[PDB]
Amino acid sequence: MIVDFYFDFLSPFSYLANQRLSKLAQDYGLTIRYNAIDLARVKIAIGNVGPSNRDLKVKLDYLKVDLQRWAQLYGIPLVFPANYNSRRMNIGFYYSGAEAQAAAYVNVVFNAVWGEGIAPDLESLPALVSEKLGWDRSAFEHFLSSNAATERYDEQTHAAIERKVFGVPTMFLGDEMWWGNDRLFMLESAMGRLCRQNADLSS
Amino acid sequence: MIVDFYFDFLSPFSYLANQRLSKLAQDYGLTIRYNAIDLARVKIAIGNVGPSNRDLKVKLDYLKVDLQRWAQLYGIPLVFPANYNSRRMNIGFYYSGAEAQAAAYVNVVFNAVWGEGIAPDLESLPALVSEKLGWDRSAFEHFLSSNAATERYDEQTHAAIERKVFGVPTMFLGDEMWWGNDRLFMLESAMGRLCRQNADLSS
Numbered sequence: 118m119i120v121d122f123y124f125d126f127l128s129p130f131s132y133l134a135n136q137r138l139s140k141l142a143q144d145y146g147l148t149i150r151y152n153a154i155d156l157a158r159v160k161i162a163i164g165n166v167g168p169s170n171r172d173l174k175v176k177l178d179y180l181k182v183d184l185q186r187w188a189q190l191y192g193i194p195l196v197f198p199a200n201y202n203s204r205r206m207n208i209g210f211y212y213s214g215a216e217a218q219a220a221a222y223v224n225v226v227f228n229a230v231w232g233e234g235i236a237p238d239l240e241s242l243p244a245l246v247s248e249k250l251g252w253d254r255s256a257f258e259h260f261l262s263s264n265a266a267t268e269r270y271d272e273q274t275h276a277a278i279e280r281k282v283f284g285v286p287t288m289f290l291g292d293e294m295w296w297g298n299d300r301l302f303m304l305e306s307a308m309g310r311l312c313r314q315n316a317d318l319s320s
Numbered sequence: 321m322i323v324d325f326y327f328d329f330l331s332p333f334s335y336l337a338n339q340r341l342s343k344l345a346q347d348y349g350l351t352i353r354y355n356a357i358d359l360a361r362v363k364i365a366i367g368n369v370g371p372s373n374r375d376l377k378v379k380l381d382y383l384k385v386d387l388q389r390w391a392q393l394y395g396i397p398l399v400f401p402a403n404y405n406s407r408r409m410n411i412g413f414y415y416s417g418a419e420a421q422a423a424a425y426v427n428v429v430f431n432a433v434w435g436e437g438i439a440p441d442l443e444s445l446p447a448l449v450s451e452k453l454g455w456d457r458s459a460f461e462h463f464l465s466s467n468a469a470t471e472r473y474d475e476q477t478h479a480a481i482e483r484k485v486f487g488v489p490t491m492f493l494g495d496e497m498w499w500g501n502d503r504l505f506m507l508e509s510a511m512g513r514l515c516r517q518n519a520d521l522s523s
């Protein structure tokens with residue numbers, strides 16, 4: 118079974134969604150197709166140009182509380198980084214190879230930025246992540262500034278916009294799209310219905 | 321046990337929250353303190369002046385899907401009215417007396433506007449609601465245009481802003497605030513923890 122997952126490493130709701138999706142992968146063998154995309158571009162595409170919730174202190178104050186409530190439910194830390202400059206690490210997702218290493222990259226980067234609060238534009242973060250993954254630091258860093266890397270990121274952002282993705286985290290199963298860590302329960306219910314049909318427990 | 325509930329009849333997520341809160345009231349004896357407030361005013365107060373999700377077609381298209389998913393979970397219809405001009409009916413909440421009649425007003429108006437799709441500024445809706453509640457139509461209609469009615473609505477909107485309410489539906493228990501029908505599960509868990517402490521099942 119396959120779920121398409123759309124995220125931007127600036128998003129703490131995406132950090133939460135990735136944690137829960139990774140557990141489904143490891144606990145149930147769910148297959149995740151990862152897509153790192155530019156939230157800023159998807160928002161401007163659909164006309165969402167007003168002040169971001171990041172810039173509305175009273176709402177951000179509550180969202181910070183919501184985020185801690187979910188981190189406590191999930192048993193994980195959640196620490197705000199000093200900035201939301203996720204472009205380099207989003208692009209770096211496209212260096213990863215097959216599924217294990219794609220998931221490993223997404224997990225290590227989310228845990229660094231939102232689990233530890235490491236700024237996503239820290240100059241040494243590509244090297245730190247390379248060391249963790251067993252990658253060639255110099256080759257990764259060269260990939261990050263290459264034209265082909267930006268093109269792949271732009272290609273995926275555009276495809277997500279064509280698919281009617283307006284935010285992150287966004288998940289698809291079949292023709293159904295959910296937006297939010299707080300809609301993963303509906304994706305899980307749809308997966309169960311498909312598990313039951315396939316097992317002949319349901320028509 | 322008391323929950324403060326903040327809603328605007330323009331809000332379909334508030335319609336969903338009111339349905340679930342009313343069931344908690346009727347199934348568990350939860351006490352709800354209802355507050356009809358002006359969403360537009362609370363948004364402008366915290367600086368949320370960008371295009372509304374109402375005006376972003378691609379996001380609204382998804383929100384309409386989310387709304388139907390929840391209406392199906394809850395077993396209720398949800399039908400968009402022709403407009404979101406909820407001021408008169410919000411003000412009319414302040415005609416209601418004690419708890420049963422306050423809940424009855426909120427239920428009947430939400431069911432009319434979002435259960436049946438009746439425009440909230442329909443000129444005959446105050447009379448229709450009066451007939452249902454056993455109220456004097458002429459006295460209600462006079463109340464709706466009175467200065468004292470607007471003042472009470474403005475007073476409650478202002479108090480909600482002072483309380484850091486930025487949207488609807490908003491629920492408080494004690495010092496904890498949740499925003500969204502999709503956070504009622506956390507309010508329900510907090511209520512259960514308090515039920516257990518009070519019963520001496522937990523310290």
Ligand SMILES: COc1ccccc1/C(=C\C(=O)C(=O)O)SC[C@H](NC(=O)CC[C@H](N)C(=O)O)C(=O)NCC(=O)O
Pocket residue numbers: 127128129130131156160165169170171172180201283284285286296297298299300379
């Ligand atoms: C760094 O971003 C940030 C910090 C703290 C709180 C939220 C955010 C969001 C982004 C932001 O403010 C913008 O840059 O716009 S994360 C991206 C948004 N996701 C959600 O708000 C999911 C909310 C859920 N209810 C859930 O997951 O529980 C997002 O996609 N914004 C687009 C939109 O249309 O709102």
Ligand SMILES: COc1ccccc1/C(=C\C(=O)C(=O)O)SC[C@H](NC(=O)CC[C@H](N)C(=O)O)C(=O)NCC(=O)O
Pocket residue numbers: 176330331332333334359363368372373374375383404486487488489499500501502503
């Ligand atoms: C008529 O409003 C409407 C129609 C369809 C979909 C949403 C709405 C919302 C309001 C709107 O677009 C504005 O007028 O701004 S309902 C009010 C908002 N509530 C929510 O979006 C709750 C979302 C939850 N995840 C949930 O309940 O599941 C609202 O409070 N907006 C303020 C904000 O800061 O977003």
